[PDB]
């Protein structure tokens, strides 16, 4: 295997990979006309460029020491490899909620701003695609330390995963199971953009002179390329600056290890101690596994970016597009009421799986998209207009009976809509996990497409709910609430 | 509340 066929192949990679969305219809053929190239260069290469002779355990008593002379908590805790989540912190004590167990000093975090006074700070100076993304910049600032072995930080990487569940670790037939679905081109997209970004900083090292000092110069496989992103994406913070002014994105050892249950936020950056803080989200008996809140996103992103499917998900919700039709006679007052509340004309909104299925911004939205004339115009005109631009986003106050009808009546008809266009049913998914044997990464991907139609399936009841709801308050002639 | 939320791997955009 020669250097000069491995450029060959990147240098094919990053113009197929540069090239212009070939249309949503040819897309999956684009993703495995990808993946071929990607595991022809893979297979040539020799994985991950720096291996470790130990096992992962063997390097955790470094990381505690290393953590505890430069300040950080280490007791209280212990590593230990739980079967459901991999390795996590288990409490060698009980710790009460609200107690400040957890603490590491800015001096262990590895951020954008170590990284533009670390041996990549050079090339920082030069590329416009690391200035403007600190996610890239972590990452192969991750990378040049993993191949430094005397970096400050090596008793954190010696301690990192070997390997991901991100669907960039996927096999071809269990991204398969995404066919039809929202979540797929975004795993089209993670994987186009990480290949292009291998290949555009393949040929970025070989060719600028402030890389000739880089590590990555002798050697950079996409294996570490794919291995430093994961890294990055399913554990990257962010923090303040030491100034306070402004924002940067932070890999925090030790407390990275914590994995995610339900709650809230209990981890906050304290800037005049220039440290993370966390404290303890619930009661944590000796012995018990002790979680963090990782934030409220869906399980396709905690599928996409953190590479795991997490079951009860009370924050999870799907996308929808929506947009006023130039075509319809009212276009203009429409785009003028949502112009004034703040709402664009067309935009990518979110059903959730929550009590009620719309925030308050598709809420508006749905109420302008039906409104008559006469409804607009009062919305536009006089001294009670602003007045009921203030209460649109508000399920208490509706423009009218009829217009809570028709909005409703359409919501339920395009969530029905929506559904007819996946390849299965619930009724199937549900049969695939009961009598299927599956690997891990199948089954997030199967539960990943159910949760899509299961909650489209309770926005079409909540729906049709709500429609019957306003359509009594019609017949009856109730009241308008005001005001 | 806190001044500063720390978000586990808060999702950010790579293109
Ligand atoms: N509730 C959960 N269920 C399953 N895996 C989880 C989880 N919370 C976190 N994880 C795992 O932990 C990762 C975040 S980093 C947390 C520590 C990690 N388990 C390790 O061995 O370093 C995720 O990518 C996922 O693989």
Not at chain 1, 82 to 111: C, N, Q, S, Y
Not at chain 1, 132 to 161: D, K, V
Request: glycine share 4%; with cysteine.
């Amino acid at each position: 295997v020669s250097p000069k066929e491995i450029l060959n192949l990147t240098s094919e990679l990053l113009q197929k990979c540069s090239s212009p969305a070939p249309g949503p219809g040819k897309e999956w053929e684009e993703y495995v006309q990808i993946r071929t190239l990607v595991e022809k260069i893979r297979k040539k290469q020799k994985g991950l460029s720096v291996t470790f002779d130990g096992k992962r355990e063997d390097y955790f008593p470094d990381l505690m020491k290393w953590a505890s002379e430069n300040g950080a908590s280490v007791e209280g805790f212990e590593m230990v490899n739980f079967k459901e989540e991999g390795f996590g912190l288990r409490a060698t004590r009980d710790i009460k909620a609200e107690e400040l167990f957890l603490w590491v000093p800015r001096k262990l975090l590895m951020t954008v701003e170590s990284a533009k006074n670390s041996v990549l700070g050079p090339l920082y100076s030069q590329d416009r695609i690391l200035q403007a993304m600190g996610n890239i910049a972590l990452a192969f600032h991750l990378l040049c330390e993993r191949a430094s072995p005397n970096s400050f930080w090596q008793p954190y990487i010696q301690t990192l995963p070997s390997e991901y569940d991100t669907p960039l670790y996927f096999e071809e037939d269990e991204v398969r199971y995404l066919q039809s679905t929202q979540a797929i081109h975004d795993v089209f997209s993670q994987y186009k953009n990480t290949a292009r970004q291998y290949a555009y900083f393949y040929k970025v090292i070989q060719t600028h002179p402030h890389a000739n000092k880089l590590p990555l110069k002798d050697s950079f496989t996409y294996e570490d390329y794919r291995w430093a992103v994961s890294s990055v994406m399913t554990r990257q913070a962010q923090i303040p600056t030491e100034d306070g002014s402004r924002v940067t994105l932070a890999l925090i050892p030790l407390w990275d290890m914590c994995n995610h249950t339900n709650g809230l936020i209990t981890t906050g950056y304290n800037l005049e101690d220039d440290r993370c803080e966390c404290v303890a989200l619930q009661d944590f008996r000796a012995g018990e596994q002790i979680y963090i809140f990782y934030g409220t996103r869906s399980n396709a992103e905690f599928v996409i970016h953190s590479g795991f499917f997490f079951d009860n998900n009370s924050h999870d919700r799907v996308k929808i597009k929506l947009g006023v039709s130039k075509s319809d006679r009212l276009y203009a007052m429409k785009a003028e009421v949502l112009a004034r509340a703040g709402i664009p004309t067309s935009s990518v909104f979110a059903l959730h799986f929550t009590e009620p299925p719309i925030s308050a911004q598709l809420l508006a939205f749905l109420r302008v998209f039906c409104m008559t004339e006469e409804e607009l115009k009062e919305h536009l005109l006089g001294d009670s207009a602003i007045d009921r631009i203030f209460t649109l986003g508000n399920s208490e106050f509706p423009v009218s009976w009829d217009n809570e009808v028709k909005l409703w009546t359409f919501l339920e008809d395009r969530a029905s809509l929506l559904l007819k266009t996946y390849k299965t049913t619930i009724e199937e998914d549900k049969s695939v996990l009961k009598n299927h044997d599956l690997s891990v990464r199948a089954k997030m991907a199967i539960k990943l497409r159910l949760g899509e139609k299961e909650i489209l399936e309770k926005a079409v009841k909540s729906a049709a709910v709500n429609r019957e709801y306003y359509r009594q308050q019609m017949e009856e002639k109730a009241p308008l609430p005001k005001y | 509340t806190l001044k500063y939320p720390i978000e586990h791997g808060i999702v950010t955009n790579w293109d």
